[PDB]
Symmetry: none
């Protein structure tokens, strides 16, 4: 009981139309002229996309503080057990900043929801050692970091889920090493929907089993699209699990994410995916809806 | 002719200035508008994920004469500062790119290589040995199909100057029955990464080597990444060469570093390394240091 989710009572057509209507209303609320993007704007050399900027008020890691590095990213806090860092895939010259952040902040879990390249276009740049390599790569920037494959825990590849788990060790000279897990999900291309519901659930299982003492880092390419869906689904499902799901939960959750990082949930079908994950958790068939989106 | 009003300013005047010049230098180059195409293609030969050689000045490709091409790769760039010597600022080559580096030295008849790093620093590999280490005999075959060999010059043994932390290696590259090519490599091990020389004399000795070297070929300078200590040494060279010829202006230090960054992204990494150029120019002008 306690959960109220009347979305499952609507016909397929009404469900599709309500999602479109809500997403348009969210875009309708966009007003970035009034928002400060000061720090993000002077660091365009490290922005993957010129007009995808991080809000100053929630800029990470600057709001936990001189932070000598820049990631185009924001702290997402929805009054839940986990906070998140939603950020872009760092560009090559921004990778040392990204790794330094992971290291200084002791980040335990990084979730990457894109391939490096999709459809003939670059989405992200590699920041982990390749399997076929020596097991370690280094950055020269920010006084140097080395990132290595964990010698006592090999990379895991889950073919059906399209998930790869990399257990990594970040180190600076004469400082203690820091272990972290990167999880890459390559089965959900930009402009599409996840190939299977199970993969997103597996990602959220990682989130839940990770420590609440540090935020979980999540990125796609610009860090507002698939990244926003993942964080939104987590939030929405937490409400479900604690009996506080309401008819407005998805809209409310996305609205609150948007206040903390402009443009969160970038595409209509990405907003739709949050409803789909709720339905799957509830055991409601999504096949006809998936059909309409394809 | 020498105008350097930097000496006639307060202690917190100078420090304030350098800070702001370097902070200006940090934002000069827009990587979004720079090609790194060949360096990105040769990622497996790069020592660092974040350190890429600019296409426009990539060496030795930048010297090739239209349609002609280069079958090897170094992460290195030609640096021209309108001075008698030119430089190839490059990384310490990785094992996979050692043959390329040695092929470059042989084909371009490089006379002098300056190495401003140890092989390892504090447990981390900074460089890979590309010279023989035998009981003086030393002649080793280089990988690839070329037929390149590198030997210690039988007529002139390695020299170890323990006072200046400098080693001088006289080496020979030889391929087939082509005329062999001699060169000198000078390694300075008293300059930690991201940091400053422990000895002004050691630095001055490297510059003497540079000045005394032939002007008909560029001088190869590498550290680990090939931008920090390498950039500082080249910057110091330039500024001093200006202080010599009497062309030292107020804005000479800024202008050489700005010129270097144009030709290889990121030259002179840390602000402290930018200071060394000012320092070893004031300390040459007999003006007392601060230091920090």
């Amino acid at each position: 009981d306690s959960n109220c989710f009347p979305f499952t009572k609507l016909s397929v057509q009404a469900q599709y139309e309500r999602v479109q209507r809500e997403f348009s209303l969210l875009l309708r609320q966009e007003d970035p002229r009034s928002i400060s993007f000061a720090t993000s704007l002077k660091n365009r050399h490290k922005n993957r996309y010129l007009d995808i900027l991080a809000n100053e008020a929630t800029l990470y890691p600057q709001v936990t503080d001189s932070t000598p590095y820049y990631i185009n990213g924001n702290l997402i806090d929805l009054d839940l057990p986990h906070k998140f860092v939603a950020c872009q895939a760092p560009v090559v010259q921004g990778i040392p900043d990204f790794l330094a952040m992971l290291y200084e902040k002791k980040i335990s879990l990084v979730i990457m929801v894109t391939k490096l390249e999709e459809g003939g276009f670059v989405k992200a740049d590699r920041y982990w050692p390749e399997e076929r390599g020596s097991g370690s790569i280094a950055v020269s920037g920010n006084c140097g970091l080395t990132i290595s494959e964990d010698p006592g825990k090999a990379y895991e590849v889950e073919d059906e889920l399209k998930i790869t788990r990399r257990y990594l060790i970040l180190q600076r000279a004469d400082e203690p090493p820091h272990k972290f897990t990167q999880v890459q999900y390559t089965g959900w291309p930009d402009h599409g929907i996840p190939q299977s519901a199970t993969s997103l659930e597996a990602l959220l299982t990682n989130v839940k089993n990770s420590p609440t003492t540090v935020p979980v880092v999540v990125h796609c390419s610009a860090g507002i699209g698939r990244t926003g869906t993942l964080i939104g689904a987590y939030a929405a499902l937490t409400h479900l699990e604690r009996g506080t799901l309401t008819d407005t939960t998805v809209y409310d959750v996305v609205s609150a994410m948007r206040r903390q990082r402009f443009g969160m949930v970038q595409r209509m079908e990405q907003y739709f995916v949050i409803y789909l994950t709720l339905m799957c958790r509830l055991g409601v068939d999504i096949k006809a809806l998936v059909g309409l989106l394809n």
